[PDB]
């Protein structure tokens with residue numbers, strides 16, 4: 001019924017497909033940053049994951065925050081001692097956009113463990129707003145995943161939670177995932193999740209919807225498969241920890257397939 | 263930066279900040295300026311502003327009020343909009359004796375449904391439709407304003423804020439505390455507004471949540487599992503609710519014609535799944551003869 005918005009879901013998908021291009025960070029940005037690295041970004045995103053867990057924020061908020069950090073950093077160079085400040089303003093902003101009850105500024109100063117003052121966080125918020133020019137209604141992996149879920153027959157909670165798990169891991173590593181779009185990562189994550197759990201494949205009904213096939217998903221799907229297999233070893237670990245919870249059906253405990261048989 | 267704007271008068275106060283009628287001294291354009299004090303020591307830029315600006319910068323439609331610019335001083339933030347001449351509420355009171363001509367009510371509903379379909383097509387819920395928020399111009403347009411309460415939704419929807427929509431216009435699925443609500447809440451509000459345009463008085467003027475429900479129930483009948491499957495299982499549903507018979511819908515708004523009645527009945531359907539969408543309501547026979555005349559009164 002109306003919760004799945006039957007009269008508007010296609011129009012909305014179409015609209016999101018348009019905005020994800022306009023809202024895409026620039027892929028080569030980290031090369032042009034003098035003092036921060038891919039690894040320093042990983043550490044930050046992993047931290048924001050803890051923050052989301054710590055304040056029981058929506059997963060959507062997390063994805064939104066990162067989109068903001070990535071776009072801001074596409075046009076602003078930032079010293080390593082200030083990277084966390086950018087992230088904190090971003091997470092503050094994301095919460096204001098997405099949360100019914102967002103944490104208050106005072107709390108955000110607190111989890112930066114008194115590195116930055118309230119003054120700083122607020123000024124930074126303002127700055128992120130100028131650079132993003134208030135364009136905060138961005139498409140994310142989850143906005144797509146959530147529509148893809150409507151295609152499984154019947155719905156499987158293990159599949160749903162695993163796909164969000166794999167989407168979230170992609171947020172951590174700019175190389176390679178900074179070059180795929182939200183909709184394509186979601187699609188890879190959906191397939192990989194579905195195949196892992198049920199043995200089934202990216203279905204004809206999503207080919208109709210998205211235009212993507214396994215052949216057009218293969219390159220992303222191959223990177224995602226690697227990340228999955230190497231996760232227990234990755235230096236960053238908060239997402240694995242987060243998805244052990246019953247909340248997400250403990251999917252991070254599942255065994256990745258040895259092959260994708262593509 | 264506010265260098266080029268000359269103030270004329272205060273218009274009012276909405277969800278946040280204060281609106282002013284101003285004019286560009288260079289172009290001559292008449293504008294409305296939403297001004298938000300940011301003394302900072304509060305909590306920075308308010309989520310109401312962050313939502314209204316990002317949503318409105320995307321929503322470009324002749325029946326959605328137009329955001330022209332944002333001016334962003336260190337401790338003060340100005341939003342420059344297109345200016346409209348009055349709100350629907352004042353117009354209705356100005357039409358106290360004559361009432362509103364049926365072609366103008368007709369036009370207004372059509373336009374309102376366009377603007378709303380466009381919001382819904384762009385994943386935005388307005389969540390505060392009411393005559394105070396609907397603005398008119400001399401040329402015959404009506405537009406949706408104040409997206410302070412609006413939000414961007416996902417598909418399917420999550421649970422969002424419950425304290426939502428002005429009471430006289432709040433849909434029964436919210437009043438019954440249902441964990442999910444969707445685009446149908448905006449239709450209920452436009453349903454009430456259509457009634458109001460015909461009668462010039464609120465359809466359900468409640469003074470509390472329970473009185474609001476009861477006023478709705480005495481008009482459309484108390485809903486059961488037959489008319490609305492799953493009502494009796496809703497968090498704020500009480501089996502002790504009085505069970506009122508449903509009124510012959512011709513009695514709800516007596517002057518309304520058969521096609522009008524049909525449309526209104528489908529906007530006020532209890533079950534959000536069955537309630538007519540903005541998209542579909544545009545093709546209703548009620549609008550077969552629709553034009554866009556100028557208001558019959560000087561604004």
Ligand SMILES: O=S(=O)(CCNCCCO)c1ccc(Nc2nc(OCC3CCCCC3)c3nc[nH]c3n2)cc1
Pocket residue numbers: 273274275276277281293294327343344345346347348349351352353394395397407408
């Ligand atoms: O109707 S008015 O003449 C003033 C009386 N209104 C009080 C409520 C009962 O009627 C009037 C009001 C607004 C405008 N024009 C207007 N109003 C806005 O909003 C102010 C309004 C909206 C929300 C409630 C607070 C006041 C705008 N936002 C962008 N452009 C605008 N033009 C013109 C005449």
